[PDB]
């Protein structure tokens, strides 16, 4: 029973549907790298700035591909849009459910270090 | 890799009803894809899924292409296409190739859009 949340977005292996809904399941074949510009962009939406705060990359290196917790999985509706849905309380969101966490992992790491 | 992966579409044309078109995408990079899917979107309208297919093969049509669109992909060349038999005018819009990874995070990449126009 995946939906994606209202409104429009704010700019094994195969999936699994469910409805016009797709599941996006991992593959443990291979494992899926993304780009350096990908994890500056990454950054820079929890809130590293990488050219002033370079020791903070490393949370948005590990933040980028956090596995989703509990029983959240991505999914893409009918227009193609990624949401993420939890299947243990039909809750959904846009966002990763992780980003959270790792914006306030970002805060506390930049007091840490001054 | 440094540079993100890349949809570079093509194939979008002019053709009359009942005429054929094929449409061609390729991504940068040697990445694995989970999913592969094409969509389309007529001014003012949503963006709709017309046709998609897994990395083993299984695929998914919207109920007004089927039996005249065709997915398939050759994952050696990172390429996926689409053939288009019977063209109306409702088919008339911009087509967007997608292509999704998991990581965790799903990577989605879309194409810039090639318009295809059926005339009557």
């Known amino acids: 029973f995946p939906r994606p949340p209202p409104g429009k977005p704010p700019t094994a292996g195969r999936p699994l549907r469910i409805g016009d809904q797709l599941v996006l399941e991992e593959d443990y074949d291979e494992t899926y790298i993304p780009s350096e510009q990908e994890i500056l962009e990454f950054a820079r939406e929890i809130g590293i700035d990488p050219i002033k705060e370079p020791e903070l990359m490393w949370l948005a290196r590990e933040g980028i591909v956090a596995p989703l917790p509990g029983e959240w999985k991505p999914c893409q509706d009918i227009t193609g849009d990624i949401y993420y849905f939890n299947f243990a309380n039909g809750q959904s969101m846009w966002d990763h459910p992780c980003d959270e966490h790792y914006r306030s992992l970002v805060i506390q790491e930049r007091a840490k270090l001054s | 890799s440094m540079g993100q992966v890349q949809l570079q579409e093509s194939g979008g044309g002019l053709v009359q009803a009942g005429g054929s078109l094929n449409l061609s995408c390729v991504a940068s990079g040697s990445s694995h894809f989970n999913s592969m899917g094409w969509y389309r979107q007529a001014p003012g309208k949503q963006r709709d899924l017309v046709a998609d297919?897994?990395?083993?093969?299984?695929?998914n049509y919207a109920d007004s292409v089927k039996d005249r669109f065709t997915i398939s992909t050759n994952n050696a060349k990172n390429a996926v296409y689409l053939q288009m038999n019977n063209l109306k005018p409702e088919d008339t819009a911009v087509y967007y190739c997608?292509?999704?990874?998991?990581?965790?995070?799903?990577?989605?990449?879309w194409g810039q859009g090639t318009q295809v126009t059926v005339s009557s």
């Open positions: 297919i897994s990395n083993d093969g299984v695929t």
């Open positions: 997608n292509a999704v990874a998991v990581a965790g995070r799903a990577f989605s990449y």
